[PDB]
Ligand binder design. Sequence first.
Ligand SMILES: O=C(O)[C@@H](O)[C@@H](O)[C@H](O)[C@H](O)CO
Ligand SMILES: O=C(O)[C@@H](O)[C@@H](O)[C@H](O)[C@H](O)CO
Ligand SMILES: [Cl-]
Ligand SMILES: [Cl-]
Ligand SMILES: [Cl-]
Ligand SMILES: [Cl-]
Ligand SMILES: [Mg+2]
Ligand SMILES: [Mg+2]
Ligand SMILES: [Mg+2]
Ligand SMILES: [Mg+2]
Lengths: 403, 403, 403, 403
Amino acid sequence: MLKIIDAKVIVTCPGRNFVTLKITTEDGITGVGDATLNGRELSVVSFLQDHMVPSLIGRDAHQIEDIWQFFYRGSYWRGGPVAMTALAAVDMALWDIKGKVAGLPVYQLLGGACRTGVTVYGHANGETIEDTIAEAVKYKAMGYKAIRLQTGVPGLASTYGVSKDKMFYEPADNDLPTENIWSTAKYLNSVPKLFERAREVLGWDVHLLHDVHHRLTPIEAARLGKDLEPYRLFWLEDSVPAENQAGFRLIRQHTTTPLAVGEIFAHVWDAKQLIEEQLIDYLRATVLHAGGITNLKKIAAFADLHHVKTGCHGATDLSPVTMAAALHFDMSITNFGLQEYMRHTPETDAVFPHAYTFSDGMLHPGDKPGLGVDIDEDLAAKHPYKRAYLPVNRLEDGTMFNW
Amino acid sequence: MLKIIDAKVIVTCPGRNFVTLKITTEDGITGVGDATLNGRELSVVSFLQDHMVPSLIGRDAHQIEDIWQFFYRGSYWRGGPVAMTALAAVDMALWDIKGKVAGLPVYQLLGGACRTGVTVYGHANGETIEDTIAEAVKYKAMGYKAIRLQTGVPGLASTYGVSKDKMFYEPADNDLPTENIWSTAKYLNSVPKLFERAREVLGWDVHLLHDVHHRLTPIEAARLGKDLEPYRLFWLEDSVPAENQAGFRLIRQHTTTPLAVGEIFAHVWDAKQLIEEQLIDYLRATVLHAGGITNLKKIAAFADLHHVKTGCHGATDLSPVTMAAALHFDMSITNFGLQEYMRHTPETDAVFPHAYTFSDGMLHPGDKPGLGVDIDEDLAAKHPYKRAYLPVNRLEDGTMFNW
Amino acid sequence: MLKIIDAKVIVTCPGRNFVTLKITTEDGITGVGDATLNGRELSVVSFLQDHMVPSLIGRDAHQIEDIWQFFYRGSYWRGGPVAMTALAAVDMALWDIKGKVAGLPVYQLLGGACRTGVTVYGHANGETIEDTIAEAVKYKAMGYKAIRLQTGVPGLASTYGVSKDKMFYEPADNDLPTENIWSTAKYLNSVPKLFERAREVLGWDVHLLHDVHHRLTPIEAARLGKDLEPYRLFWLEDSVPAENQAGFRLIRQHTTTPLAVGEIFAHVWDAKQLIEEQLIDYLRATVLHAGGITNLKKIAAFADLHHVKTGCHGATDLSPVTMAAALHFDMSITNFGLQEYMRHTPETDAVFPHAYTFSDGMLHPGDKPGLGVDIDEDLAAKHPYKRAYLPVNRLEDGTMFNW
Amino acid sequence: MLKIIDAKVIVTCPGRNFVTLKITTEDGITGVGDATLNGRELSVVSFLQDHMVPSLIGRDAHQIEDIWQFFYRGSYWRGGPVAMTALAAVDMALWDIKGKVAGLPVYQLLGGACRTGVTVYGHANGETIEDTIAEAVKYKAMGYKAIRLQTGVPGLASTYGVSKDKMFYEPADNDLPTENIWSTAKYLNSVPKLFERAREVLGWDVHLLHDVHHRLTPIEAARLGKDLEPYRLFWLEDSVPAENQAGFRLIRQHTTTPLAVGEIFAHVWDAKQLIEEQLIDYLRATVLHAGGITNLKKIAAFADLHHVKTGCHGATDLSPVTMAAALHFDMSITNFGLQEYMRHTPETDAVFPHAYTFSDGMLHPGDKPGLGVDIDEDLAAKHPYKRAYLPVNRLEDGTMFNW
Ligand SMILES: O=C(O)[C@@H](O)[C@@H](O)[C@H](O)[C@H](O)CO
Ligand SMILES: O=C(O)[C@@H](O)[C@@H](O)[C@H](O)[C@H](O)CO
Ligand SMILES: [Cl-]
Ligand SMILES: [Cl-]
Ligand SMILES: [Cl-]
Ligand SMILES: [Cl-]
Ligand SMILES: [Mg+2]
Ligand SMILES: [Mg+2]
Ligand SMILES: [Mg+2]
Ligand SMILES: [Mg+2]
């Protein structure tokens, strides 16, 4: 019986915004969870502290599932990114506690080690094809086994994933949304050239990825998928907005390029049709935005029935706390595919001291009891919240579109 | 060009919590929109004032659809109760402003009057059948053409819809969520007697409704539906949790009792399969919780291709701002089914003076420019926020369940 | 790192045959897992000691999921009752060891407590209706919340569930399989009277079950299901052989009597269509015959996406080791339906001392570290293996049929 | 009335393990059946001798079908490789007896001769493409009309089907499973080159096969299928693990390369969806592992309705007894496709003297009464069981995978 005596939502910006729940049990055992929802951070803060937290006090922290259900069902209005991100943080924290009590790293509870480390991909980008490739060469020298390639679009001032940042990508860069302009035709005409060149310079053993980032229609993705088959990509991610899951039928019907989707998914329902109809090969949903370890685990199992692997989203806006948690999950399942790994700042790392390590293209969560992560509150207090928005995207005619 | 110069979020609790958005244009033309999310109110307040509101400043209030898209797509993490309720408030207020600029009630902009008024249902409930029927008799004498009936379950301390309230039902009643105990079997064995007796006393002209409130499995709903066929109910609402929309296939397959669902839906995607497969007869989604007049209008047109009518939710946690917007939408569509009408408190009515009127079993939005509703800010300020939660539900063995 | 130093298979027959696997770790921490396959026991014994066991030596007992996969995939010939029962024993014993290492009951590792106990059903049976009802009355007085009812068929020497046993049923009763004679028509014409009378005497609060035990065609099950609707059965189990899972479509299409199936299933693939098409309401698959806690947990999460609950089989040929593992799993899931509970003999209980307890219609696994169960090897050795077979069934014309 | 007076399970290892049932009738007529289940041999031994055999004694051997049903249904737990391999051996033996009594080879009972002999394929392999091709040239000179091609994968230490053995392949080569490492990307990049070269050297009249051996996902096989179309393969076998039969839809949708699957199948249910949806062109299931002559015959008939032919598995771990039986089946059906033929050792041939012969690319079962095979018990006793396991396979990251 592990009485919860305190729960606190902490907000800090050591290079970018992060929200963190910290839960303290009667005898001083603590657990932390990530609750960062990029571009909408303080909405999760309230949902937690004004609403969910008062129900945590006095409860038995052992009851992870019951607590999961109490909040998911109890809110009445169900699901959604704000609600499911709040719950992920409770869940992460509860598993962290569980691990400490058991005296085991969290993966030891979830099925134990299924591989020697978690293979990641990094983030090569450049304004030109040459730029991008040079970045990919760098990554390949650094021992990355998988690399994502993004490059500027001829005749467009900007496009997703290209900037001055090289080991990562931080698009929430302004106190109002940065405005972008877009042309599907110009992208579709040019981006295949990138992977053609990538194969010429980099060879065939390295895994290459691409994030389309919500900008195509199904018949368009189908075609990009087709143009990309000669270069044997690891996956083509978020090719089309997926609220209409049937949208992926057209793509699957026309290309064999492997498909990923789901960083934004809040619950299993966002991916069910996609999984059950075998329309994707990788699910990108994370413990952070789809309701924590408890839920992602149920989802991965459903996914394994349909040849679907995990390709968990790994952007900078997932704190080290999420990443510790993602690693314990990644380690413990059979159908793991890949883990995205964007480098945080050295200030972020200082605020969220963690046991996980990177070597030979792989992350490993380490073997500390629980998650193997904590939050330095004093250092945290040194960096207050600063408002920052994700960018937005319009068509050439001004049409409001998808960034 | 109608420049937005200010936009403020107002929180008041004249009998229960309500969140309101009030937008002001350069020329002093104002609009209001409801943003209430029962039991998770402050989270919407944050989502709006900390995140959405700053983007409103300086925009042209005329661009309703662009602003709608800007917010829906620009959030990146899409949909969900929080985001869509916040967007509803914006949408309602822009429509209000549109109305005023045009010197017309909103419904005149959306298609014109399609009926002489909007037929409502009221809520009769009680511990015993005779208590519930006694109440139904009152509502009929009051000229209601439709009545929802809820009654206690023999062998259970409490059930949905049953309490000391007669003209409404207000479960957001405690500083921590009230816990309840549920038995499906006891409920299924008893409720049909409710309606048998209802028909004996009230006869066959009055429409009789029932809200199952999330507590059945499809095969159980099938059976309850069948048991209730003899009494010709207008609808059987929320019989099963709808995240799995294919769930309704089994109900539809076994009973001709007409089906309602959707008060908690945040977007078209929560109902798409239900509508396209003709699994339901009434959609209960509202302008408040499904992204406003803009979104609900698209949804209604889609629903009409498949014999689905509107039966919008209208419990008291929808403020009179919602009700005004709901009544304009209701007036303006071919496929109107019915409108729920729970009496707000006198204090609430005073805080949100409105033009809409109730006569002869029907509401009417009235004919003022805009929505015909405002918030009295001085009066509002006399009624501070008071934290209050919806109740939760567990099975006899203690399993977390749905309320 | 928990090196496996020994792993031995133990065969004993304290009232009936049981096969047990006992794994020993370098530091003297041990675990047990049930490996009993009624009527084909020694085949599992061989599969384990001659083939699987040698691979266990020297492995890290922590790696539960890897060992699970090693054995499932490494056998080459996959699935099947033998292989999956043998793997179940391994899985149970590793979970037992995991529990002990962590100083926690297994259920604490799988999600924590979700209910205050695990509601069971007992078995009332008899030659005549009055004999069966007489027995149901006893079980109700004993505080059972659920009761299975089986009764003799007029015009048939014998039928399933009927015999001189009251608190259990043990058909593995002869050195060569007992032969029986079956008539579908006589059964279908009589059994509904069972439940009519059951309801008259026992009333409508108690859950009433029925195991058809494989003897119908879909169109026949459809009809029996319909005939039994008036009596509101908790479930109708194994109504038809399920190798053809589309068979349930016709039943589901014609009746709202809730359906159970699956005690004999060896893997997820035996139930996948049944679950995904919502053809059933309860899955009867067990940790013993479907590859253990590891597998059953994935299966349960899948079943929960489709309104399917667990109604695990629990006849006496599942040893108390199975029951301990079953109770930890049952305690830990949101979608628990019910647990079958057949009383083991006193001698059996003595051979497998256990922590689980029965009170007020509910079992509880208790709170010892691990599964909370052991085999007493000296006592076990006093009860040699005794060959015993399940009975077989033929039609009136002599056709080999299903028992 | 042919009373069975004795049934004996014989175990021997004349180069590799084989299990054999021998059944003796009252007047001295005997029949033999194969019961070898590679890597799990003694599990079938027990299932037979400890469990099934006692029910054979005293029965009428004429009753092949009733006996088939008695054991398949009678076991209660149904199907699975262990159970279905045991039953195959009973069935083979019973048909062998039947043929002797009738004084005819077994094919004469099953429909008689449908072709002049049974066309086979052999097994070319090599570390390099050159190696493999040279082996295929050899086979083509030896008069083989069909040849399977396997070759080493660049940058992998090992891969399926390559070894020092040339007229066959014996992978169960160790007293614990040999461990292998795997890379899908490296295989997919290189194996098409093999068949390109094969066509250049060998020409277009010879039939060429390839066994993928369980290592791809559907979208991957689809692609390999596509890359292989220019070389017009006879089939691409076991491209993906088939427990999810819907997995083959994606492949069929994208390639016209002919598909085979099923050596591991235990029953019709393992192939039904695959057959009924026309997802494969060849079924590889055998009399050995899918329940003997009786069952495979029913299956072939179902297969003929959907353009599916037999491509029976023929590895060394099917004894001459199985091969005699496979030939009588192959001879007697309209929809025969191909028979795999790996050479046994000369010691195996001595222990299982057989009447079947090989010439001009074809096997023929001969025209002796019954199967035309027996087992030399004295020679058999000269070679005791020796434990040997099939290999296993992990990904580069250590993930437990499919061999
Ligand atoms: O149909 C209804 O009126 C009910 O579902 C509502 O009272 C519901 O319980 C509340 O609006 C939830 O806030
Ligand atoms: O539901 C049940 O309890 C029955 O199906 C079992 O008694 C079954 O007959 C035996 O467990 C088979 O071993
Ligand atoms: Cl939300
Ligand atoms: Cl939301
Ligand atoms: Cl098996
Ligand atoms: Cl088996
Ligand atoms: Mg992305
Ligand atoms: Mg309702
Ligand atoms: Mg049963
Ligand atoms: Mg093969």
